[PDB]
């Protein structure tokens, strides 16, 4: 109806309704009164000029009042007047800067000096946890933010519908020289190119893909070719195994694996004109492959194998052990007198596992 200080008759939406005392103050009397309080009075004098309802000699309501009054003070005062309000509040009330919170839902900023761990945004009126800033719900009560954050990501239907594709995407590819983490699946292609440092490496074992005449490995027979050297438990080799034999290594060590979902939805980064377009794998998803394609299901099996440091050499036949001996020990094996095939096999196996460790830079877990 009219301003409670000067009587000027304005509509209700043309004045400032003080959220505490419910008084309608004209924009001019509001501004002039509060600044002169900053100018020559004290901060306990920041009460409504008409009424006086905020008791400033009372440490009960002092902080929640300035929290709400700060909003209207920001919109009505000048920049220098608003700065003295924070300086005097810091130097006379809090002995520190006020806790300013940004509502993640509507982008509003406000002072929050209450003891509760949940805060109500004065603008959108939604409540959120002060630490993790996610939307507050009853499930968060008595639970750490991580527990709560993991609980929502775990039961969001869109996340669960992706299936094992998320596990493949989440296990990142870290460039061994520039340390950039790409967080992509591998599929069937091991030769990785890093955009930042141009390093070429194997995404399964992080060994270098050497250019022509650059490989320094002794007894390398493809020095004039682009190539890398891989440990025996690198996906580069284990991708050639059938899913059945990969599962047998997991079963021999009591490691569980999915074969049904918990084309292929695994996201790949295809290069388009100026940019990368995330195009899904989309290849056939056979039964027993947990909703993935074959290459992505084998990658999933191998990362389980690598995470548990399972040794594929435990399943090698004699000819496999002989290949492994020449590849990694650089000696052609040969049976000795009195040895039957199992004894020969047991000897080659013991020497290989003692001298050649599993992938030393393979990402495990």
């Amino acid at each position, epitope marked *: 109806q009219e301003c409670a200080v000067c009587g000027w008759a304005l509509p209700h939406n043309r004045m400032q309704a003080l959220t505490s005392c419910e008084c309608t103050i004209c924009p001019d009397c509001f501004r002039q009164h509060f600044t002169i309080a900053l100018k020559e009075k004290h901060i306990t004098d920041m009460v409504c000029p008409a009424c006086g309802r905020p008791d400033l000699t009372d440490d009960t309501q002092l902080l929640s009042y300035f929290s709400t009054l700060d909003i209207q003070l920001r919109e009505s005062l000048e920049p220098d007047a608003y700065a003295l309000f924070h300086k005097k509040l810091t130097e006379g009330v809090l002995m520190r800067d006020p806790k300013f919170l*940004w*509502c*993640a*839902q*509507c*982008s*509003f*900023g406000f002072i929050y000096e209450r003891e509760q761990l949940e805060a109500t945004c004065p*603008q*959108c009126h939604q409540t959120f946890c002060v*630490r*993790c*800033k*996610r939307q507050w719900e009853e499930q968060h009560r008595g639970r750490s933010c991580e527990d709560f954050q993991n609980w929502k990501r775990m039961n969001d239907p*869109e996340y669960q519908a992706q299936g094992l594709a998320m596990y493949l995407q989440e296990n990142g590819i870290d460039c061994p020289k520039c340390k950039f983490s790409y967080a992509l699946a591998r599929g069937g292609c091991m030769h990785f190119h890093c955009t930042q440092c141009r390093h070429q490496f194997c995404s399964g074992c992080y060994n270098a893909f050497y250019a022509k005449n650059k490989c320094p490995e002794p007894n390398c027979r493809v020095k004039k070719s682009l190539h890398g050297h891989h440990p025996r438990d690198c996906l580069f080799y284990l991708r050639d195994w059938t899913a059945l034999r990969l599962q047998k290594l997991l079963q021999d060590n009591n490691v569980m694996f999915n074969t049904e979902p918990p084309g292929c939805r695994v996201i790949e980064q295809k290069e388009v004109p100026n*940019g*990368l377009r*995330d195009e899904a794998c989309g290849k056939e998803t056979p039964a027993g492959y947990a909703g993935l394609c074959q290459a992505h299901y084998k990658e999933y099996l191998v990362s389980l194998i690598n995470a548990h440091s399972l040794d594929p050499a435990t399943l090698y036949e004699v000819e496999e052990l002989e290949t492994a001996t020449e590849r990694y020990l650089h000696v052609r094996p040969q049976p000795l007198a009195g040895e039957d095939p199992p004894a020969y096999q047991a000897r080659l196996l013991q020497k290989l596992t003692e001298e050649v460790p599993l992938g030393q830079s393979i990402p495990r877990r």
Partner: nanobody
Amino acid sequence: EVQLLESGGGLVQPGGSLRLSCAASGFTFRGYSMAWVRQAPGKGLEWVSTISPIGTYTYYADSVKGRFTISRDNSKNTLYLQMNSLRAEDTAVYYCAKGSYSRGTPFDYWGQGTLVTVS
């Protein structure tokens, strides 16, 4: 990682129409609120509008409410700003912004911007 690419800015006469787009990638788009801000020539940054993660709620600055309409397409990871009845004060570089759950800021990423001129 995170990227926000704005497009749709240009020259337009007063009372005209213009629709900006912000293509988002590198994060779960549907799980964050998004916003439009703008910087008029020589002036300070100004907030324009914010939209909720799934679009239930929209918020607008006073000078643009009713003229501008914010919207999003989570199927495409794209954020839109439909600007109607442009004025001369609307000339500015426009930026889309990703809502942030980190303490200390309401947004943690801004695009490279798109220039709008109203002659």
